[PDB]
Amino acid sequence: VNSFSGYLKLTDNVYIKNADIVEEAKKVKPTVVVNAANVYLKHGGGVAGALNKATNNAMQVESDDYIATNGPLKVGGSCVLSGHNLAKHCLHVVGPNVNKGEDIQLLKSAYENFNQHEVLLAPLLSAGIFGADPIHSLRVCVDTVRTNVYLAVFDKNLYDKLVSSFL
Ligand SMILES: O=C(O)C[C@@H](NC(=O)c1cccc2ncnn12)c1ccc(F)cc1F
């Protein structure tokens, strides 16, 4: 038993809600919150900009030190950093950004990172301003992640569309 509330059960392990991931994090303080990052950990907009703003830019400061030491992530890759005031840890996951011309096949690899954590609060990878088909992303999530994932979908119309079309 965990402390997530009001989530629609989709499969044995995936749950979904129309909510802001920052507010869910502030309420639940999960072990792991997922950021929809880019390879440079430059947290400008969407999920990343919102999470970073909620940490008062501490996420960005930590991220810049990570990149200075380790270099960029791979598309499809991830790193574990602090969750600051929002969670114990933040799993920064790089899904493909279709608006950058990145390869959508890498979405499955991106979701595989979730399997290293027993429970996660996460956004829908590569949705929104990342330019991928959100129905497809949800299918890949359910068909790839085996650990317990709680998805927070920000856009109400998107949430309604995802629920109504889910197989
Ligand atoms: O509407 C959506 O859920 C899709 C969209 N979400 C957000 O931008 C967002 C902004 C602030 C709080 C918040 N909580 C949950 N999502 N979310 C999105 C997802 C992945 C991505 F890589 C880029 C995106 F733009």
UniProtKB/Swiss-Prot annotation:
Localization per record: Host endoplasmic reticulum membrane
Domain of life: Viruses
The Macro domain, residue ranges: 1-167
Activity modulation comment: Inhibited in vitro by GRL-0617.
Topology versus the membrane: Multi-pass membrane protein
Catalytic activity: Thiol-dependent hydrolysis of ester, thioester, amide, peptide and isopeptide bonds formed by the C-terminal Gly of ubiquitin (a 76-residue protein attached to proteins as an intracellular targeting signal)
Role: Responsible for the cleavages located at the N-terminus of the replicase polyprotein. Participates together with nsp4 in the assembly of virally-induced cytoplasmic double-membrane vesicles necessary for viral replication. Antagonizes innate immune induction of type I interferon by blocking the phosphorylation, dimerization and subsequent nuclear translocation of host IRF3. Also prevents host NF-kappa-B signaling. In addition, PL-PRO possesses a deubiquitinating/deISGylating activity and processes both 'Lys-48'- and 'Lys-63'-linked polyubiquitin chains from cellular substrates.
Summary of subunit composition and partner proteins: May form homohexamers. Interacts with N protein.
Protein name: Papain-like protease nsp3
Organism: Severe acute respiratory syndrome coronavirus 2
